[PDB]
Amino acid sequence: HHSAGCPSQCSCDQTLVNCQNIRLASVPAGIPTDKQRLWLNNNQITKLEPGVFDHLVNLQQLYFNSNKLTAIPTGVFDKLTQLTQLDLNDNHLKSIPRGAFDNLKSLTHIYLYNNPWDCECRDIMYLRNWVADHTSIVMRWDGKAVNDPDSAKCAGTNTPVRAVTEASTSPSKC
Numbered sequence: 001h002h003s004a005g006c007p008s009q010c011s012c013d014q015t016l017v018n019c020q021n022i023r024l025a026s027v028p029a030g031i032p033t034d035k036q037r038l039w040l041n042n043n044q045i046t047k048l049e050p051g052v053f054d055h056l057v058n059l060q061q062l063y064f065n066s067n068k069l070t071a072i073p074t075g076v077f078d079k080l081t082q083l084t085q086l087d088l089n090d091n092h093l094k095s096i097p098r099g100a101f102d103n104l105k106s107l108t109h110i111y112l113y114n115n116p117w118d119c120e121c122r123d124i125m126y127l128r129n130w131v132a133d134h135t136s137i138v139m140r141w142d143g144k145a146v147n148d149p150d151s152a153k154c155a156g157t158n159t160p161v162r163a164v165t166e167a168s169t170s171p172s173k174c
Contacts, residue, residue, distance in 0.1 A: 005032035019043070020063070027052050037061040041087065044068055054079045063087040065111065072096055078103045087111040089141075094155075095123040101130055109139045113148075116155035122169040124161065127152065131162040 006012035007028035010019040016037040019028060024043040031038065033055050045067040053059070057079050069091040077083070077100060084106050093115040101107075112131075118124055131138055135149035150160040 005030060007031060013037075031056060034058060039063045040067065042066040046070070048073060048076050050076065053077065056080065057082065059083055060106075061085045065089040065091070067091050069093055072100055074098070074100055077101065080104065082106055085109040088115065090114040092116060094118040095121065096127045096130070097123075098126040100126070107134075107137055109145055110134075110137050111139050111141065112152040112161075113140050115152070117152060117161050118174075119154035119157070119159065119161060119164045120169060121174040122166070122171040123174055124154075124164060124169060125166055128161055128164045135162070 004012065006017065007019065007030050009022055009024065009028055010017055012018070015035060016039065017031055017035045018039050020039040020041045022043060024045055026045060027040060027048065036058055038056065038059055038061070041063040046069065048069065050073045053076060059080050060082055062080065062083055065087040070093065072093065074097040081103055083104055086107060089111045095118060117127065131149055131152055136147060138147065138149040138151060139145045140148045140151040149162055152161040153159065154161055154164065
């Protein structure tokens with residue numbers, strides 16, 4: 001008999017696929033394409049499969065904070081041209097691949113804080129430049145969203161990623 005599109009581990013609103021807080025180790029199959037909001041935060045997702053969000057073209061809000069991501073496939077957000085809010089805080093990200101955010105032209109809020117950004121490695125230069133060119137959308141949460149471009153910080157030293165000088169980075173320390 002006919003059932004709803006919703007992943008069975010998750011809960012669904014008219015506008016929201018709520019998959020937060022359910023100890024997921026991977027992104028569930030069958031996320032409906034007509035929803036504008038996806039919460040995958042506070043899980044234990046360690047990887048994003050290439051192509052996972054490609055059909056989710058109407059998505060406006062994607063929360064993926066407090067997971068265990070160590071890398072982002074370069075083209076993973078390519079189809080999310082409507083996306084206005086993206087939360088990646090509290091993952092294990094070390095850098096963003098060059099051009100990863102190229103197609104995210106509607107973003108008003110991106111959250112990047114509490115990731116071990118590796119500022120000794122020259123791969124950090126894409127994120128450095130991107131933050132520096134989009135400071136008005138870099139946000140941290142403190143009750144409400146607060147615009148703070150210094151909130152993406154280098155692992156260990158806590159210096160802002162956007163202040164990193166290329167000369168302090170190395171291509172062989174990666």
